[PDB]
Amino acid sequence: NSNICEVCNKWGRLFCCDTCPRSFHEHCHIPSVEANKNPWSCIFCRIKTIQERCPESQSGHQESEVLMRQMLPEEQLKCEFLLLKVYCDSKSCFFASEPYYNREGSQGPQKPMWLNKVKTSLNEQMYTRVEGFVQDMRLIFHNHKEFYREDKFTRLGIQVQDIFEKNFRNIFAIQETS
Ligand SMILES: [Zn+2]
Ligand SMILES: [Zn+2]
Ligand SMILES: [Zn+2]
Numbered sequence: 001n002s003n004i005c006e007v008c009n010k011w012g013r014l015f016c017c018d019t020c021p022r023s024f025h026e027h028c029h030i031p032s033v034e035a036n037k038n039p040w041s042c043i044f045c046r047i048k049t050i051q052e053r054c055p056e057s058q059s060g061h062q063e064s065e066v067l068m069r070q071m072l073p074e075e076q077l078k079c080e081f082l083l084l085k086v087y088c089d090s091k092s093c094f095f096a097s098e099p100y101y102n103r104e105g106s107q108g109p110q111k112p113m114w115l116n117k118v119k120t121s122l123n124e125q126m127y128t129r130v131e132g133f134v135q136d137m138r139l140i141f142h143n144h145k146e147f148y149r150e151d152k153f154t155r156l157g158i159q160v161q162d163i164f165e166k167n168f169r170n171i172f173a174i175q176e177t178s
Pocket of ligand 3: 053054055056057
């Protein structure tokens with residue numbers, strides 16, 4: 001197995017996947033690495049299994065159909081994995097914890113949002129459809145763009161949004177377009 005966490009790229013107390021060489025900190029893995037379960041398969045392996053069981057699940061989909069899906073176990077898992085993919089990028093530190101807003105010439109967003117809040121929400125089964133999760137995710141970046149206006153720091157939002165969106169199109173097999 002790897003000797004660093006797959007998400008944060010640091011060593012520490014790591015849990016090793018039984019079906020692939022990845023390793024995780026307990027709370028870096030999403031969901032948090034399970035207490036017992038020998039063998040244990042990580043989220044990457046669980047997502048691979050879904051594809052393998054139903055190869056046609058990789059044919060193209062319309063985003064509007066994906067968003068209306070109810071959060072049954074497989075969609076729950078896919079949103080967990082997509083969230084995990086954003087945390088995999090070091091630039092996610094900016095959006096992880098609860099933000100605050102005091103900048104001359106700007107007002108804070110009406111509905112603040114952040115990764116750890118989406119993480120809790122998924123854990124607590126607060127989203128009933130994929131749309132719930134994707135809306136909160138996109139709101140993180142939109143709040144950032146609006147607040148930081150013409151400061152160059154706005155680019156961090158564009159950058160982390162692009163990671164989210166690429167992973168969304170991959171995980172949920174959105175039909176490719178020009
Ligand atoms: Zn980690
Ligand atoms: Zn694995
Ligand atoms: Zn099938």
